[PDB]
Each structure stands twice: as C-alpha cells, then as structure tokens.
Amino acid sequence: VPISPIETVPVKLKPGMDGPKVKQWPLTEEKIKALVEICTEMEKEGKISKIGPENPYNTPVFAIKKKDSTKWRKLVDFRELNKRTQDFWEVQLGIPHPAGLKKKKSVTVLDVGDAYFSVPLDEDFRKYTAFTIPSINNETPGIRYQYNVLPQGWKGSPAIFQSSMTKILEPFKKQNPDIVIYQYMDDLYVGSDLEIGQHRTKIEELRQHLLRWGLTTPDKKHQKEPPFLWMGYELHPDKWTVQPIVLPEKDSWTVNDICKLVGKLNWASQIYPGIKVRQLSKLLRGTKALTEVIPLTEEAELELAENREILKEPVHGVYYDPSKDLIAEIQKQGQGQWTYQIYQEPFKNLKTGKYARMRGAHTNDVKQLTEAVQKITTESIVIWGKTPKFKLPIQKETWETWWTEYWQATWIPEWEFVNTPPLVKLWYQLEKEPIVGAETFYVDGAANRETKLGKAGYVTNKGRQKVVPLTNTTNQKTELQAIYLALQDSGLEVNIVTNSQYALGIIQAQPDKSESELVNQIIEQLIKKEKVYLAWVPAHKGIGGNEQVDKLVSA
Amino acid sequence: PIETVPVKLKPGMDGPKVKQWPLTEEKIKALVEICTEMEKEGKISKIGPENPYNTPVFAIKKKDSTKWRKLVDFRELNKRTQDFWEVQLGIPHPAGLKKKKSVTVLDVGDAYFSVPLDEDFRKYTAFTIPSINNETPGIRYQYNVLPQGWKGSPAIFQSSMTKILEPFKKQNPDIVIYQYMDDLYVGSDLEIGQHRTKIEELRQHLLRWGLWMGYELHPDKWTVQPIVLPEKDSWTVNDIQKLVGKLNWASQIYPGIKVRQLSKLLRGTKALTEVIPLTEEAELELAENREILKEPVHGVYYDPSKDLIAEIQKQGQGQWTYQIYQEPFKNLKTGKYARMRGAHTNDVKQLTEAVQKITTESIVIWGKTPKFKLPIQKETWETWWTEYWQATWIPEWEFVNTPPLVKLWYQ
DNA sequence: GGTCGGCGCCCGAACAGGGACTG
DNA sequence: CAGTCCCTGTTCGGGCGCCG
Ligand SMILES: CSCC[C@H](NP(=O)(O)CO[C@H](C)Cn1cnc2c(N)ncnc21)C(=O)O
Ligand SMILES: [Mn+2]
Ligand SMILES: [Mn+2]
C-alpha cells in the first residue's frame, strides 16, 4: 500500500479495552450490490485492503442514499469502537453564518468528493476498523476489508479530517492572505476582492494545491455563478436567505411531528422575524411516547397559523459591513417571549432570533430583558466578534432605578431607548423609609409539619387584627399569606413588618410574574398600592406585634 | 540544553477538558499575532485532535498598558497539580511584606519561557484559538516551555530565581521579595524616590539575565471596615427595629452583643414613624454594644491549611464591602471600596475591579488567592468579566443571591 | 436508515445547597 | 444538637432542527 501524502494522526484505544467484535446486520440485496460495487472500487484505489482470519475484529456496515443523486454512501456502525477509542478534542467550535460574511467581488464554492476517503488512517489503528461485506448468498463467507482512510461513523474521523484539512490549506492561505476561505469540513467558500480574471486563476491554483494531496474538486460540485448554495442558504450578491423550508401539514399530530415542527420553526427564526413556539412547545411537556397522538390546543393552532403566514412572505438577510455599526433591537412579544433583529441599516436585517427561557419561579420583565441582551451579545461575538448597540423598549430612568437599587451586580452595554410598546417597566416600588401616617401591620404565619395546618394574620397599631386558618400549607406559604392579608386589608399606603426572610427576599426583587398564584396575588395587590414599606425584624425577640402575632399564629 | 523537571498530575485525576469561550475580534487578532511569534521562537507548537485536553485562552491589557497580553485560564490545571507547588517545591510567604510602606509588583512571566517543560506534561497545556464566525476550525497549540499562569512555573523557576536575586538581596537585605505566579512583589520602607530607583536597579539586574512595568502598593495604609451603629438624637420605632436586627446579626460575630433592653422598647404594636425615647437601661446597652464592636473578635487567626473565602456586598452608590474568612463569622479582614472604575455606571466593571484588589491584598498578606462568592448572576458575570480583567492570575469564584438583610457592613 | 462531530431549541429528572423547625 | 423538608436553582440526558 502506497503512503498517502497527508501526515497521519496517531490514534490509540483507551487503556485496557480491545477492538470491536460485532456480527453483521442482515442487509437488503439492493444495498449489498451498492456496497460490493463501492468496496471493489475503493480497494482498487488503495482505500481499503483485504484481511484474513488474523484479524479477530468486526463491525456492522450499511449504506444510505445520497441526496439528489444515484450514488450511495458507505457508513459503518462504529458504536462499539467509539466507546473504546481514545477521546478527541473537537476542533469544530461552531457553525458559520451568512450574516458574518462580508461582500466580496468574487465568490467560489466547491466540494471535495469522498472527503474522508482521501485522508489516511493511522497504520497501527487500521486493524480495529475491520468489517465483513455479506454476499448475495448467506452460505458465502463474505469479503472482509479494513479501512486505510477515515471511516464514516468513527468518532475520530470528523476531528481528524478538519485538522488535516486546515493543515493542507495553510500553505495556500499563507501565500494568499487576501483570499477568504471558509472551511466547514470539506465545503470551501472562497471569496476575494481581486479582479474576476485573477480570481479564476487562484481558484484553479487552489484546486491543484488540493489535488497534490488527494483532494479532488469535481466540476459537478463547482459553483461559479450566483446564487450560491452554501450551508443551507442561498447567497446572492446583495442578500441571502435560507433554502426553502417545508412544514408538515399533518391532520393528526404526534409528539415526534411536533419535535420536527418545533425544530424547523427555530431554524426559520434566524431570518423570519416573529416566530413563536411557546404554545407548540407546551404540547411536549409531561409527555412520554414519541409516537403518541396529541391534539392541538386553540393557542397552538393560532400560533401555528401565524407562523405559516410569516413563512408565506419572502424574507432575506444582508451581509456584514464592518464600516457601519451593529444594532440589535428587542421586542416584548408574548409573556415570557422576546424577539430581536440584528441589522446595520434600517429594515436590512443581518439576522433575527428569539429568546423565551424561563429562569426561576419569580421574575420580571427587566430580568428577562437583561437575559436576552446577554444571549444576543454572546451570539454577536461568535458571528461578528463585537457587541452590537442595543435599542431596548425600556426607559433610561426605568433601567437606572432597577440596576442601582438591585442588590446583585447587573449591567447592559451601550444602548438607547426605543419607544415601541409594550414598554418594559417596574410595576411597583417599595419605599426606602417608613411611611408617616400609614397603618403599620405586624404580620406572621406558622404551620405544622405533620398536620399541614397553619395560621396567618396580622396585628396593627390601630388595633386592627385578623387570623385565618390554613389547610395543607407550609411555613413559607403562611408567611406569604400573612403579607397578602395585610395588603388586602390596608389602604393605599401601608407599612408591613415581617420576620420571613423567604417572603421578603421574593418581594424585594420586584417580580411581576410568578409560578405561585399566591405570589401573583401579592403582586396584583402591590400594583394597586401607592406606597408600600416592607421591613424585616428578627423573630422570637419580642419585637412589637411580631411576638403577639407569632403567638396568635403559633398553632 | 536544560534538564527538565519531571511533573505529574495528582493521583487519580485527568487533565483539564474545558471548552474555549467566544472571543472578540481584537482578542483573536492579538492572540494570533502572539501565538505566531511564540511558535517562531519555539515556545509553542501546533497539535492535533489526538490531544483530548484543552484550556481556555483570552487576552488582556494591564492598567495603563497598550500591549495585549496572552492569558490562559489554567485554574483547572492548577487544581489538578496542587501537590506539586505545595509539597515538593513550595515557596514561603514572608510575613513582613504586608508591613512595608511600599510594595511594587513586577511581571516576570517572560522568564518562564527560558526553561523547557517536561515532555510528558506538555499534553495538558493544550489550548485552542477560535475564529470569528467559525471561518476555520480551531487552531490548537501546546506549550514547549514553562507556561504563564501555571502554578508549576514559579515552582520550577524558583531555584533559578533565587540565584538571580541573590546578588540584589545581599546588597539590599532589608528589602522583601515575594514571587506569586507571574508577578514579583518587592517591598521596602524606603522613600518613594529611592524605592522606585531600587526597583529600576532590580529591573536592570533582571535584564542582564534574560527577562518591566510596575504597580505600586502601600499596605501600611490598608484600612478595615468595622461594624458601626448610628448616632441619632431621635430614634423611631423603625430605627430601633433596624438597630436590633443589625445587633442580632452582629451577635453571631461578637457573642457579647445584647438586645434585651432595646427589645423592651419595642413591646407595644407601635407605628414605625413614632419617636421612642431611649430608656437609660437601653442607652447603656447601646453604648456597651458600641464598645464591643471596637474590640477585635476572640479566637480569630489565620490557618495556613484552610482555604480563604471572600464575600462581596453591593452597597450602592459605588460602595462595595468585602470580608475575608476561613471559618464562618471568623473574618480575618473586612474592608470597603468606593469610587472605583465604572462607578455609577457599570456594576460588572466595579465588581471585576473589586475582585482584583481583594485578590491582590490576599496575595500580599497570606500568599493565597481566596475563593469568591460573587453577588451576580452566572450568565451576567461570564458575559463581561474578561472585558475588564487586568491581572495575570484568575481566582476561583462562585455565584450567590442573598437579598439584603439588615445592611450589616455599611451604614 | 436507526454511523459520527459540531451548534441551536425544548423538556423533565436528577443533582445540590441554603433556611427554619424538631428529636 | 443533627436531621428532615420546603424551596429554589443548576446540570445533564434526549428528542428534533441544521450543516458536512
Ligand atoms: C448529498 S449527501 C452529502 C455528501 C457527503 N460529501 P463528502 O463525503 O465529500 C464529506 O462528507 C463527510 C464524510 C462528512 N459527512 C457528511 N455526511 C455524513 C454522514 N451521514 N455520516 C458521517 N459523516 C458525514 C458524503 O458523501 O457524506
Ligand atoms: Mn464533499
Ligand atoms: Mn412565622
């Protein structure tokens, strides 16, 4: 076997484990002909070699059809070898995006045919990549081969190929620094600002540079004219868009059909603005069977019909001009949902997106907006390497009050207020000083761990009092209930004194939405007030009415 | 032609496998220009995916510094080699460094590149450089010399460093020199002028051996932030309720704090804004509690074997308080910062500045870096903290969410 | 078909660590 | 006192989408 021009990558097995020994799957006769036709062709090209009984290893093998072609793709079920193969560090750190491409005078795309079959495998590791090709007769012993290149299905092949491909492109890109080569596996996006005459030469130079190492660039996959098909998009000289997306129109929806729908909706949200998958993802909660039929809710049918109407109109993104600033604008869509557009010129979106994660049992719009800004910031650094300037639906004075008075550290990068309702705001403000002339409520609540019974109430400075029995409750629920009672029975201004750190900590964070309906009721009462002053005192110290109302709610 | 010092990981532990986080354009261009030049000098060489280890990498600029500085987050590799730089080649910590009138810091990380690294250990120094928009796969490297930011580098170079500093230590015996990570702490009681001159004498003394910049500290002027009680002519029910709760919390630190007579003033269900005259029994309980807060806590002393812990509280208006301790309520030091960079506009820049100042003080006083409890959300911190980092070390930290109780540390 | 690696989303279960009450 | 549980937050396993 001749030596490949590419330097091999030394690969070891994990210490203390041998190669795989798995029996071959029963293959269809139409797939057997495709394998023997490919195996005999790769054997002639030196990519696989015959092996005798001295190789005690074996692994299953199969094949799937290539998309939009009559050719076949050979795949190996290396699930047992991948378990016992050494760990690799993947060099593919992410996926390129067209919104990060800059305008170039010339663009060329070309794919490498049978990319894994042109990069050699480690000589000492080829013995473990043994497989058996079953013949048309079950009594025939079959032909046994071993891989001399990178197999398809082994966990090390993609990491080895990407590093090998980068090493071969280094001498060309070093000699041609003004040539941009987007390298995703074997897909090469080549662009330049050279004149179109000199560009065609450099493309041919690159096709020969790759040819000197065994990498073939077929003229079939060669692309010289726009629109270019690259990474699932359509690249035009002035704009880009995703390749056509098809959503299923099932009359009876299963759980797996929703997962296929939700995934395509997320994929479409990168350029199609306003995609919502809140109500459709609510169909996947608490469900077990992937094939179980589930009916669409009224909120899910409306959300789906809105997404289909957005996908009817054509949308496109633009490319990145480093000479102009990056701008990200966010909108409060639904409760818990946020959308954003990243652009440089008005209505010329580089890309779009959405944020809808619910963090914690109690939150407000300011927290979620801060989380969305961070998600966009990290996303922008990946694509453009910089943080955009933000346009946020929150008053400058609103944000100033929040971050200065909040006990956690928080910050938003350089941003400006855009007046687009609904505007994010704080729905209520706790006073920093006790209110003169307002009734002072001393609240407390307790419960029993066993009987699950408890009391909640208050004692005020005007003699007002209340105690309410509670069933199936906790110490935390009662102490929240006592504050809720003091809010119901007070005027527009009230001073409330509690000893519950748990209850006080939740309210001071100014939540406007909660998983607990009790907290929501507390919120609704807090919004109706004009001045609220909460205050904490230590318990069991005989302080004011806190000791009196503790003995009242003792049982 | 230098012999390598054999280094091993701790028994039953593998190397670091930490994913690289996204980097800005200015940091990637800086890292490429630095790593290309470091490869040209043999300090690093490219590797492949067969190395399963990796450590994050980013770039910083020190205070008033224009040049970018490569920084590797070797925190995970340092945890997995702890027995090396503590048991075998430990570096003693001078107790007099904190008592000097002036202490200057010198970045001597460039000297580590002169010593080769053990061949078997180079596999763990791996790191990957990302690309904008993932134009190319990751460009992986590994170190061929002693890496900056690794706690094994000053331990191996310790023998070489002692012989370089011996001529200077002999001429200047009253000057204290401490080496922590890539930094050199030089402390003296000299006048500012001749002190900075003695620094420049050491700078030229280090240039002739194959090695700049200084950060001045004055540990003698480091002050602590005690627990203070308000001095009011008129007290209200709310004032005394807040006073009792604060004294109740402070009683966990000072066992002599009493709130009996003060709680007796809060017997009735009174309005918060009502003025309450202090009884003479309560006035003495308040004055005696003030006297206790001036005296130090009993049985508080540093333990060399225990980890340092640092808590930070956001007090608003650019105020930031902190306490350093090893056991709860046994604070080895308390303090307060104010008017730092980013005050009244950027909490993360202020918090980043606070962590650096606290870590710097912990190195001078004990020679350790504390683990921080940060009053910030994890995603808020991990999004911006590298934008404001100006130090060659990185402390360990965790994130807490403690809503304010009784403002114990700031009036 | 039920191969691999990357990145993204959604969900629930398992993990985990602090706070107030109890033998 | 240590030992619960009530509560809350984080991490991870697994499905889909997308690319080669
Ligand atoms: C019209 S289908 C695309 C044709 C493609 N081109 P290629 O070989 O140059 C480059 O692909 C390499 C092998 C990556 N890779 C792609 N798909 C798979 C897969 N399913 N399993 C494992 N590795 C895969 C091919 O042949 O796989
Ligand atoms: Mn190809
Ligand atoms: Mn209670």
PDB file of N, CA and C in Angstrom, chain A residues 62-106:
ATOM      1  N   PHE A  62     -23.476  -0.585   6.686  1.00  0.00           N
ATOM      2  CA  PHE A  62     -24.701  -0.367   5.926  1.00  0.00           C
ATOM      3  C   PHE A  62     -24.466   0.795   4.966  1.00  0.00           C
ATOM      4  N   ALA A  63     -25.538   1.254   4.325  1.00  0.00           N
ATOM      5  CA  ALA A  63     -25.429   2.336   3.358  1.00  0.00           C
ATOM      6  C   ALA A  63     -26.773   3.036   3.229  1.00  0.00           C
ATOM      7  N   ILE A  64     -26.716   4.348   3.003  1.00  0.00           N
ATOM      8  CA  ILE A  64     -27.901   5.157   2.757  1.00  0.00           C
ATOM      9  C   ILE A  64     -27.727   5.873   1.424  1.00  0.00           C
ATOM     10  N   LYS A  65     -28.844   6.350   0.884  1.00  0.00           N
ATOM     11  CA  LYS A  65     -28.838   7.010  -0.414  1.00  0.00           C
ATOM     12  C   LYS A  65     -28.401   8.463  -0.281  1.00  0.00           C
ATOM     13  N   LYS A  66     -27.537   8.897  -1.196  1.00  0.00           N
ATOM     14  CA  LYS A  66     -27.155  10.299  -1.250  1.00  0.00           C
ATOM     15  C   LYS A  66     -28.326  11.152  -1.724  1.00  0.00           C
ATOM     16  N   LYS A  67     -28.383  12.381  -1.220  1.00  0.00           N
ATOM     17  CA  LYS A  67     -29.477  13.279  -1.563  1.00  0.00           C
ATOM     18  C   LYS A  67     -29.311  13.806  -2.983  1.00  0.00           C
ATOM     19  N   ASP A  68     -30.368  13.662  -3.787  1.00  0.00           N
ATOM     20  CA  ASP A  68     -30.409  14.172  -5.160  1.00  0.00           C
ATOM     21  C   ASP A  68     -29.275  13.595  -6.007  1.00  0.00           C
ATOM     22  N   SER A  69     -29.099  12.279  -5.919  1.00  0.00           N
ATOM     23  CA  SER A  69     -28.091  11.578  -6.705  1.00  0.00           C
ATOM     24  C   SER A  69     -28.361  10.084  -6.618  1.00  0.00           C
ATOM     25  N   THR A  70     -27.858   9.355  -7.614  1.00  0.00           N
ATOM     26  CA  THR A  70     -27.952   7.902  -7.631  1.00  0.00           C
ATOM     27  C   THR A  70     -26.802   7.226  -6.898  1.00  0.00           C
ATOM     28  N   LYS A  71     -25.790   7.984  -6.483  1.00  0.00           N
ATOM     29  CA  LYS A  71     -24.660   7.413  -5.769  1.00  0.00           C
ATOM     30  C   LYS A  71     -25.065   7.017  -4.351  1.00  0.00           C
ATOM     31  N   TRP A  72     -24.277   6.122  -3.765  1.00  0.00           N
ATOM     32  CA  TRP A  72     -24.506   5.634  -2.415  1.00  0.00           C
ATOM     33  C   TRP A  72     -23.402   6.113  -1.481  1.00  0.00           C
ATOM     34  N   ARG A  73     -23.709   6.096  -0.187  1.00  0.00           N
ATOM     35  CA  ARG A  73     -22.776   6.486   0.860  1.00  0.00           C
ATOM     36  C   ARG A  73     -22.581   5.316   1.812  1.00  0.00           C
ATOM     37  N   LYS A  74     -21.325   4.933   2.026  1.00  0.00           N
ATOM     38  CA  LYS A  74     -20.992   3.799   2.879  1.00  0.00           C
ATOM     39  C   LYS A  74     -20.799   4.282   4.312  1.00  0.00           C
ATOM     40  N   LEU A  75     -21.560   3.705   5.237  1.00  0.00           N
ATOM     41  CA  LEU A  75     -21.499   4.059   6.646  1.00  0.00           C
ATOM     42  C   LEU A  75     -21.206   2.818   7.478  1.00  0.00           C
ATOM     43  N   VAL A  76     -20.488   3.017   8.580  1.00  0.00           N
ATOM     44  CA  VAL A  76     -20.082   1.935   9.469  1.00  0.00           C
ATOM     45  C   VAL A  76     -20.670   2.197  10.848  1.00  0.00           C
ATOM     46  N   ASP A  77     -21.255   1.159  11.448  1.00  0.00           N
ATOM     47  CA  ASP A  77     -21.817   1.249  12.796  1.00  0.00           C
ATOM     48  C   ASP A  77     -20.690   1.019  13.800  1.00  0.00           C
ATOM     49  N   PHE A  78     -19.911   2.079  14.028  1.00  0.00           N
ATOM     50  CA  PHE A  78     -18.779   2.049  14.947  1.00  0.00           C
ATOM     51  C   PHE A  78     -19.168   2.405  16.377  1.00  0.00           C
ATOM     52  N   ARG A  79     -20.399   2.097  16.793  1.00  0.00           N
ATOM     53  CA  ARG A  79     -20.834   2.466  18.137  1.00  0.00           C
ATOM     54  C   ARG A  79     -20.041   1.736  19.214  1.00  0.00           C
ATOM     55  N   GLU A  80     -19.535   0.538  18.917  1.00  0.00           N
ATOM     56  CA  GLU A  80     -18.721  -0.178  19.893  1.00  0.00           C
ATOM     57  C   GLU A  80     -17.266   0.270  19.863  1.00  0.00           C
ATOM     58  N   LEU A  81     -16.745   0.622  18.686  1.00  0.00           N
ATOM     59  CA  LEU A  81     -15.371   1.108  18.609  1.00  0.00           C
ATOM     60  C   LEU A  81     -15.240   2.512  19.183  1.00  0.00           C
ATOM     61  N   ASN A  82     -16.268   3.350  19.017  1.00  0.00           N
ATOM     62  CA  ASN A  82     -16.213   4.704  19.557  1.00  0.00           C
ATOM     63  C   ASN A  82     -16.197   4.706  21.081  1.00  0.00           C
ATOM     64  N   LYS A  83     -16.781   3.683  21.710  1.00  0.00           N
ATOM     65  CA  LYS A  83     -16.755   3.607  23.167  1.00  0.00           C
ATOM     66  C   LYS A  83     -15.350   3.319  23.680  1.00  0.00           C
ATOM     67  N   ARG A  84     -14.581   2.522  22.942  1.00  0.00           N
ATOM     68  CA  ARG A  84     -13.259   2.095  23.375  1.00  0.00           C
ATOM     69  C   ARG A  84     -12.130   2.860  22.698  1.00  0.00           C
ATOM     70  N   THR A  85     -12.448   3.856  21.877  1.00  0.00           N
ATOM     71  CA  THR A  85     -11.440   4.704  21.261  1.00  0.00           C
ATOM     72  C   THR A  85     -11.126   5.882  22.176  1.00  0.00           C
ATOM     73  N   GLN A  86      -9.884   6.359  22.101  1.00  0.00           N
ATOM     74  CA  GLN A  86      -9.461   7.486  22.922  1.00  0.00           C
ATOM     75  C   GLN A  86     -10.328   8.709  22.648  1.00  0.00           C
ATOM     76  N   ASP A  87     -10.430   9.577  23.649  1.00  0.00           N
ATOM     77  CA  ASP A  87     -11.190  10.807  23.490  1.00  0.00           C
ATOM     78  C   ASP A  87     -10.417  11.803  22.636  1.00  0.00           C
ATOM     79  N   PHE A  88     -11.147  12.553  21.817  1.00  0.00           N
ATOM     80  CA  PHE A  88     -10.581  13.609  20.996  1.00  0.00           C
ATOM     81  C   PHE A  88     -11.149  14.951  21.434  1.00  0.00           C
ATOM     82  N   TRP A  89     -10.422  16.017  21.113  1.00  0.00           N
ATOM     83  CA  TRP A  89     -10.914  17.375  21.307  1.00  0.00           C
ATOM     84  C   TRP A  89     -11.389  17.899  19.958  1.00  0.00           C
ATOM     85  N   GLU A  90     -12.698  18.102  19.835  1.00  0.00           N
ATOM     86  CA  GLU A  90     -13.267  18.573  18.581  1.00  0.00           C
ATOM     87  C   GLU A  90     -12.765  19.974  18.260  1.00  0.00           C
ATOM     88  N   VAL A  91     -12.373  20.179  17.001  1.00  0.00           N
ATOM     89  CA  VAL A  91     -11.907  21.486  16.547  1.00  0.00           C
ATOM     90  C   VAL A  91     -13.008  22.300  15.881  1.00  0.00           C
ATOM     91  N   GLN A  92     -14.159  21.697  15.593  1.00  0.00           N
ATOM     92  CA  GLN A  92     -15.307  22.434  15.070  1.00  0.00           C
ATOM     93  C   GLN A  92     -15.980  23.127  16.246  1.00  0.00           C
ATOM     94  N   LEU A  93     -15.703  24.420  16.413  1.00  0.00           N
ATOM     95  CA  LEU A  93     -16.212  25.144  17.570  1.00  0.00           C
ATOM     96  C   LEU A  93     -17.617  25.691  17.353  1.00  0.00           C
ATOM     97  N   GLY A  94     -18.060  25.803  16.108  1.00  0.00           N
ATOM     98  CA  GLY A  94     -19.383  26.324  15.841  1.00  0.00           C
ATOM     99  C   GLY A  94     -19.712  26.237  14.368  1.00  0.00           C
ATOM    100  N   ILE A  95     -20.825  26.856  14.008  1.00  0.00           N
ATOM    101  CA  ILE A  95     -21.357  26.833  12.647  1.00  0.00           C
ATOM    102  C   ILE A  95     -21.264  28.241  12.075  1.00  0.00           C
ATOM    103  N   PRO A  96     -20.692  28.422  10.888  1.00  0.00           N
ATOM    104  CA  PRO A  96     -20.660  29.755  10.281  1.00  0.00           C
ATOM    105  C   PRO A  96     -22.054  30.227   9.898  1.00  0.00           C
ATOM    106  N   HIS A  97     -22.203  31.548   9.838  1.00  0.00           N
ATOM    107  CA  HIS A  97     -23.479  32.147   9.489  1.00  0.00           C
ATOM    108  C   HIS A  97     -23.285  33.181   8.389  1.00  0.00           C
ATOM    109  N   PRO A  98     -24.198  33.237   7.415  1.00  0.00           N
ATOM    110  CA  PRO A  98     -24.032  34.190   6.306  1.00  0.00           C
ATOM    111  C   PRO A  98     -24.062  35.647   6.734  1.00  0.00           C
ATOM    112  N   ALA A  99     -24.682  35.971   7.872  1.00  0.00           N
ATOM    113  CA  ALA A  99     -24.683  37.348   8.351  1.00  0.00           C
ATOM    114  C   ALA A  99     -23.295  37.826   8.754  1.00  0.00           C
ATOM    115  N   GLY A 100     -22.334  36.919   8.909  1.00  0.00           N
ATOM    116  CA  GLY A 100     -20.959  37.255   9.185  1.00  0.00           C
ATOM    117  C   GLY A 100     -20.080  37.392   7.964  1.00  0.00           C
ATOM    118  N   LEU A 101     -20.603  37.080   6.781  1.00  0.00           N
ATOM    119  CA  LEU A 101     -19.840  37.226   5.550  1.00  0.00           C
ATOM    120  C   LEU A 101     -19.806  38.685   5.117  1.00  0.00           C
ATOM    121  N   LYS A 102     -18.659  39.110   4.602  1.00  0.00           N
ATOM    122  CA  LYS A 102     -18.504  40.438   4.029  1.00  0.00           C
ATOM    123  C   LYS A 102     -18.605  40.352   2.512  1.00  0.00           C
ATOM    124  N   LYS A 103     -19.027  41.453   1.895  1.00  0.00           N
ATOM    125  CA  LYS A 103     -19.196  41.475   0.448  1.00  0.00           C
ATOM    126  C   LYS A 103     -17.847  41.362  -0.252  1.00  0.00           C
ATOM    127  N   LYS A 104     -17.746  40.411  -1.177  1.00  0.00           N
ATOM    128  CA  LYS A 104     -16.548  40.206  -1.975  1.00  0.00           C
ATOM    129  C   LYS A 104     -16.896  40.302  -3.454  1.00  0.00           C
ATOM    130  N   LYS A 105     -15.921  40.748  -4.251  1.00  0.00           N
ATOM    131  CA  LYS A 105     -16.152  40.902  -5.684  1.00  0.00           C
ATOM    132  C   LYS A 105     -16.371  39.561  -6.371  1.00  0.00           C
ATOM    133  N   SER A 106     -15.722  38.504  -5.889  1.00  0.00           N
ATOM    134  CA  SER A 106     -15.837  37.184  -6.491  1.00  0.00           C
ATOM    135  C   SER A 106     -16.023  36.146  -5.395  1.00  0.00           C
TER     136      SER A 106
END
